[PDB]
Amino acid sequence: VLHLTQDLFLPFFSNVTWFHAIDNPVLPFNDGVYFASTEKSNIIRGWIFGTTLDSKTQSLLIVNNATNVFIKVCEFQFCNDGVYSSANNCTFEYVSQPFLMDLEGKQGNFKNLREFVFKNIDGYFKIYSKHTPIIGRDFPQGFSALEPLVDLPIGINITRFQTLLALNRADYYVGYLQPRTFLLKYNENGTITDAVDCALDPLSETKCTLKSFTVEKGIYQTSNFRVQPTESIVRFPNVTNLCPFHEVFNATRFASVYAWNRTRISNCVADYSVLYNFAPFFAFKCYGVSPTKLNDLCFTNVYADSFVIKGNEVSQIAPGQTGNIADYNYKLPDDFTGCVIAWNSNKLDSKHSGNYDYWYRSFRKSKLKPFERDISTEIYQAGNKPCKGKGPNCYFPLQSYGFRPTYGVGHQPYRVVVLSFELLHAPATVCGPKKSTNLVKNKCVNFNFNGLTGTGVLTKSNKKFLPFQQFGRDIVDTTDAVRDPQTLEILDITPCSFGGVSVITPGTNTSNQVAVLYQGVNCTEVSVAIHADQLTPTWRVYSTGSNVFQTRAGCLIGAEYVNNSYECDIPIGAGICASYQTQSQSIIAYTMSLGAENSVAYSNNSIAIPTNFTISVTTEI
Amino acid sequence: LPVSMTKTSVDCTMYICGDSTECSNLLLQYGSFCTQLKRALTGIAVEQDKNTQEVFAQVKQIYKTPPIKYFGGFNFSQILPDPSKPSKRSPIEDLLFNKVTLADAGFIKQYGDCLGDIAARDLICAQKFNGLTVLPPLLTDEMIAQYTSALLAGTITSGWTFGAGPALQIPFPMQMAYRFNGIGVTQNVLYENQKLIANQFNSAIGKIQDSLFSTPSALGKLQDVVNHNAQALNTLVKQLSSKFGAISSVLNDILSRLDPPEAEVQIDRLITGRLQSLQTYVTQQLIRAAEIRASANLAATKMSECVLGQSKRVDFCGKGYHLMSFPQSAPHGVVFLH
Amino acid sequence: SKFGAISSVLNDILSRLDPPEAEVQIDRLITGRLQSLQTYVTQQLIRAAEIRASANLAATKMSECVLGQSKRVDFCGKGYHLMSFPQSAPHGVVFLHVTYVPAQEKNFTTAPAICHDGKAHFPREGVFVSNGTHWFVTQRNFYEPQIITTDNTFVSGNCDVVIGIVNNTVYDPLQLE
Amino acid sequence: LPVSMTKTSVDCTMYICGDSTECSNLLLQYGSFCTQLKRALTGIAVEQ
């Protein structure tokens, strides 16, 4: 089976800092580390993980001995050389069989290599190892699987990494693994014979895309290429004046719910940290934009509705929800898109001997339409009496919201206010902070123009936008031109750099040399992008100046152009084909020859007649 | 007869999710749903290429007309390539190219001028903005004219022999006599009225050019195929402005407005809508490609019979007793002169 | 494929969640799997239509090339068709088209007609050809020159309108006897 | 030999929603999904 996996795997042909010994530098730990060592008998005992390696954060000791092991999770300080200096509040004392198996055939030349891999995904510390006798030398290059030994869930940050040594009276091979996709060849007995890193060479990505160690001669579309952005211009309008949320919150007379006071917030800059520090929040259930991205969004108009209520009514008021406060006092639209705010206020809506100032409606002739006020004093009708007054079956619509300093939490005076964002696209006014960076008219950039996020390029545009046209668009609904909010100049937005990468390869058995064809994109664009190292493809096809052919189906890289002509071998497109031809061998691209150039000797009395014949047996499938 | 359609390589991931990591992650939860789509579109492209090959590359060797052009009085200058024209085509070939307008040439590498578009970017620039590109056909419109000219020179200088084996030269009046003998009339009558038949042939060839010139659309089938493909692509791109019953229709502002574990529902709604629309497009393209494959196989059989020989089957190679057929290349198709 | 659900196995999904909460996950699986199955069935329909077209082509090819000689050029393989021997193949058929293909040929001076005595002579079948001195009639696809007799030719003309008239002597078997 | 089939002109809007304004409004949220269906059925009729 050719199972494909995505995990933390040491990249093929990476960089390993080979060390020596004769002081024990601390090495960074990130996404796990690959450890390997070859030794005579023993010079290394264990390893130290954690952070700051002191008596402040819990750390890990994996010291072995010839008898068992001593994995533990304790807050030791430093031995500076005892090893369990000030063990301290300890945890997870583990003892098991030794990791270090050493065998000799009555001679010391069997310098067995021990490859160890440690990683700390979601706690659950995993350790892998494998012992293989030497055949020649260091970091031999033959394949070798790694089996797990112990999987103990430590569940602690590990970021530094260190090792122990030995004493009494050529190793330290360390590599750092990366999140990569691998294709692994399994053998009949359940064992890993060969593996290939898909994110390595064009051939590697091709074989991986079809999950087969043998790629037959042909061209195979494997992936796509896009230029990742370098930098990012975020520019907003040219305002700075702070919004009055301070009033909306440093008021006292917040409206009763029967008449919810509604302010409008516009032409200002919203930084909701003031809203945060003006209230020991009790419920911040946003129904529009997340508070995290609240300062990253722009609003055409913002409506702040202030109305004090109680814990039950705080939950009661919500996009199109039931409840007399919601159905007869203040109603939120079913599609409400705004943040609601609720903080406890027992200091402004309470006093000794009580306070019954506030009001709320329980008796209405019908339901409350969203964002519609119903301030009125009309006695509810009961039965069929046109009665106008208080008492039996003639009930006042609105009853007191009486507040005292001593109720239960559900009966406490919760101060509720709400910011009903519009998030339409009309010229914006309340934009959050974000800081305006400058322009970059010709380089692909991630933009956040007035809440509108996206990626592309910006160039000068004569688009005669009439002085009211803003967001702008194209034929099929894709923002094409945004007038710079500050310079009013008009900016077209162009796609980043997309086409498609297809790998042209001969039979892996015939050869491994590969040729890459970026689809429908000029080599110049690819070159300035390859040179700037902003191309998403991590496989860097070799360029020698002689391997660049701007064709009509994009650009071909890794195959030279021979101004001769042959029968097509591998169809590329637009009349060019690539093939494996001798020089001593390489990949050449050529214009396909439609056949042998033949001329007929037609003339007014010349005829050709076969004086002989042949018989042929073709086949049709 | 249509021979091919525009080859498309829509990228599902790009179409359903725009450079959005969470959207791509949630698309991965749909399994190898759309690798099928990429495979099907690749198969369609390869099938179109094979259709063009079957229709046109029917010769074993490249053939060329004699430097002099005197075919017994028959005037053919309207169908053999014109040396003066840079494209090396015929008046009929150009009329055909001038009466068919392609929405997306594909071999333009239009990247770089969407930014210099100044005015609203064209359909193409917009399709590029949402991952729907057009691959160009393997055979260009220039060497396809070379294949057509090779077929033409094979018929007028070697009769139908070159369609079987080696091209044997034979005088054109003699080939006329033999085709006449093929429909039950002696060769003597042709030799007797060779002048009259030559004049009639010249008149008919001349009047077909005016028939194609003055007609609004006699190329209705090819333009219909091109319009169908362009309209399918436009309907594909237009679904990206459809909310599909969610808060908004843009991935970028949806992610920038809702936190991950509530925007998940909306993003899944978009994924379900867009994948369903893409499946609609791919299935319709498969059906139309099967139709075009049938039409192109009919065209290849028609070429192999009417062009490389005389066909006895009545009303197959045009109305009336068939004599010859001169092929002409057309945008995404072939046109016969029976 | 999880299809956006808690897990991808019905057995552990039912064994982990109670019915009226596992309903949503099971419906998500149903929607995913039915859509994938519809994809498969539609693709199989399309491929089966393609195979039906190919098999109808094969049946016509059998009925023509096998059960007879087909005059349609380049249909039963390249060259002048003679026979075709079918052979069974796994999920298909393979034909063995026996074809007649010409060979070595030479330029021959040819004339549309021969004008013996004021009258044009056209070959009953074949081409008039010239070895360089004596004129000869022969077939279409094999050089078998024969003496130009009144049997080989039919006479109809006036030797003034038949373009390519080429004076020469025809023979008759009567004046000798 | 069959020559034609019965020509159908199924109305997606009517089929999915019966004279229901809210249902038609929520169907409009699916975009030009089914204008494709009407176009395909018209093409089938013309082809027959």
Ligand SMILES: *[C@@H]1O[C@H](CO)[C@@H](O)[C@H](O)[C@H]1NC(C)=O
């Ligand atoms: C890391 O390895 C790669 C591949 O062999 C090599 O190109 C690169 O120069 C190496 N880097 C260092 C610092 O050795």
Ligand SMILES: *[C@@H]1O[C@H](CO)[C@@H](O)[C@H](O)[C@H]1NC(C)=O
């Ligand atoms: C080796 O380690 C094991 C486990 O910690 C311990 O039981 C044993 O006593 C140790 N041996 C020596 C010599 O310290």
Ligand SMILES: *[C@@H]1O[C@H](CO)[C@@H](O)[C@H](O)[C@H]1NC(C)=O
């Ligand atoms: C454990 O934590 C307590 C409380 O912070 C601290 O006083 C003590 O020194 C720590 N270590 C031990 C050995 O108890």
Ligand SMILES: *[C@@H]1O[C@H](CO)[C@@H](O)[C@H](O)[C@H]1NC(C)=O
């Ligand atoms: C580990 O420590 C780093 C700071 O050094 C911190 O950013 C990170 O979140 C920590 N991880 C955990 C799991 O605490």
Ligand SMILES: *[C@@H]1O[C@H](CO)[C@@H](O)[C@H](O)[C@H]1NC(C)=O
């Ligand atoms: C250290 O020396 C002692 C005394 O000879 C010996 O028993 C022991 O095995 C030595 N340890 C190592 C690791 O060589």
Ligand SMILES: *[C@@H]1O[C@H](CO)[C@@H](O)[C@H](O)[C@H]1NC(C)=O
């Ligand atoms: C699988 O294991 C058996 C038993 O050791 C061995 O005989 C066989 O050769 C192995 N197969 C392979 C392919 O290595």
Ligand SMILES: *[C@@H]1O[C@H](CO)[C@@H](O)[C@H](O)[C@H]1NC(C)=O
């Ligand atoms: C409003 O803010 C000012 C300044 O921080 C403070 O003095 C005042 O008490 C606040 N008012 C309320 C009601 O929070």
Ligand SMILES: *[C@@H]1O[C@H](CO)[C@@H](O)[C@H](O)[C@H]1NC(C)=O
């Ligand atoms: C509503 O708020 C505005 C702005 O603070 C204020 O001027 C107005 O008096 C308020 N109305 C009520 C009913 O409190």
Ligand SMILES: *[C@@H]1O[C@H](CO)[C@@H](O)[C@H](O)[C@H]1NC(C)=O
């Ligand atoms: C704000 O923008 C307008 C329009 O570009 C400009 O006239 C004005 O001077 C700007 N104000 C500042 C202080 O930048």
Ligand SMILES: *[C@@H]1O[C@H](CO)[C@@H](O)[C@H](O)[C@H]1NC(C)=O
């Ligand atoms: C290709 O395959 C043949 C047969 O197994 C083998 O002899 C040859 O070495 C292979 N070539 C390469 C470069 O793998």
Ligand SMILES: *[C@@H]1O[C@H](CO)[C@@H](O)[C@H](O)[C@H]1NC(C)=O
């Ligand atoms: C791509 O490079 C070719 C090289 O000849 C050049 O002619 C062409 O204009 C370039 N295309 C673009 C879009 O830059």
Ligand SMILES: *[C@@H]1O[C@H](CO)[C@@H](O)[C@H](O)[C@H]1NC(C)=O
């Ligand atoms: C093709 O290559 C030959 C050999 O180098 C060269 O002389 C010739 O000029 C080249 N073709 C063209 C059109 O430049």
Ligand SMILES: *[C@@H]1O[C@H](CO)[C@@H](O)[C@H](O)[C@H]1NC(C)=O
């Ligand atoms: C063939 O015909 C042309 C046109 O009449 C004439 O110029 C030429 O001489 C003729 N050649 C022969 C060999 O008769």
Ligand SMILES: *[C@@H]1O[C@H](CO)[C@@H](O)[C@H](O)[C@H]1NC(C)=O
């Ligand atoms: C015809 O070809 C055959 C087979 O090559 C050969 O044996 C024979 O001599 C040839 N005959 C003539 C007349 O050329």
Ligand SMILES: *[C@@H]1O[C@H](CO)[C@@H](O)[C@H](O)[C@H]1NC(C)=O
């Ligand atoms: C065909 O007619 C055109 C237009 O009169 C003339 O230019 C050309 O020489 C003619 N060609 C032949 C082969 O007679």
Ligand SMILES: *[C@@H]1O[C@H](CO)[C@@H](O)[C@H](O)[C@H]1NC(C)=O
């Ligand atoms: C006829 O003569 C021409 C010119 O020499 C030559 O190219 C051609 O091959 C000859 N044809 C035959 C069949 O002999």
